[PDB]
Design a protein around this ligand. Structure first.
Ligand SMILES: O=C(CC(c1ccccc1)c1ccccc1)Nc1nc2ccccc2s1
Ligand SMILES: [Ca+2]
Ligand SMILES: [Ca+2]
Ligand SMILES: [Ca+2]
Ligand code: NA
Length: 183
């Protein structure tokens, strides 16, 4: 099939754009096909992998958010090239590259801004995956602590974060990106 074989044109673009050598890309493709013989990873297949790694909670909500960022062309599947591009940024990117990737995750509706509700949505997704925790203080909930972090980053108090607000906000308070292991 087209999707199953690794074409030289794909390798050329990947070595131009990513931190991986041709040798590493070919190695990763062998592994990609062992887990995904079709060369196309579906959303549910993506969720299944996240369940292999967090068997206690429910990673479905978080995995679906991450999937949308991986699937950069929005065709409903992660092809090998999209897999490598995301892995390059998240495992080998510099701080600015990782913070932009985090911004794309938090900006669920892709409108150029993070809202409070979008920030809640990611945070809730993480707790579902990792283990929800009870709060007996209505003034010390995740939603409220997130509000404080958000307010500190929202320099012009318009109730939304630009990429610049989020990136310079995260370099003084990296907690929203360390929650994704991208600090
Ligand atoms: O989702 C994946 C990709 C995938 C993978 C498969 C094989 C080899 C390396 C990675 C995987 C990794 C860990 C658990 C489940 C799947 N990685 C990322 N996780 C996060 C989390 C937060 C923010 C950014 C990222 S990028
Ligand atoms: Ca795709
Ligand atoms: Ca948004
Ligand atoms: Ca703002
Ligand atoms: Na996408």
């Amino acid at each position: 099939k087209k999707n199953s074989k690794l074409k030289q044109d794909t390798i050329d673009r990947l070595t131009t754009d990513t931190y991986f050598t041709e040798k590493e890309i070919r190695q990763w493709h062998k592994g990609f096909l062992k887990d995904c013989p079709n060369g196309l990873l579906t959303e549910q297949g993506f969720i299944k992998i996240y369940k292999q790694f967090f068997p206690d909670g429910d990673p479905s909500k978080f995995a679906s958010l991450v999937f949308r960022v991986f699937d950069e062309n929005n065709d409903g599947a992660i092809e090998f090239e999209e897999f490598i591009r995301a892995l390059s940024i998240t495992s080998r990117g510099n701080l600015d590259e990782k913070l932009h990737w985090a911004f794309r995750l938090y900006d669920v509706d892709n409108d150029g801004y993070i809202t409070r509700e979008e920030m809640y949505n990611i945070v809730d997704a993480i707790y579902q995956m990792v283990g929800q925790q009870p709060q007996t203080e209505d003034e010390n909930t995740p939603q409220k602590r997130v509000d404080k972090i958000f307010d500190q980053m929202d320099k012009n108090h318009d109730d939304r974060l630009t990429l610049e607000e989020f990136r310079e906000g995260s370099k003084a308070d990296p907690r929203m990106v360390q929650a994704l292991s991208l600090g």
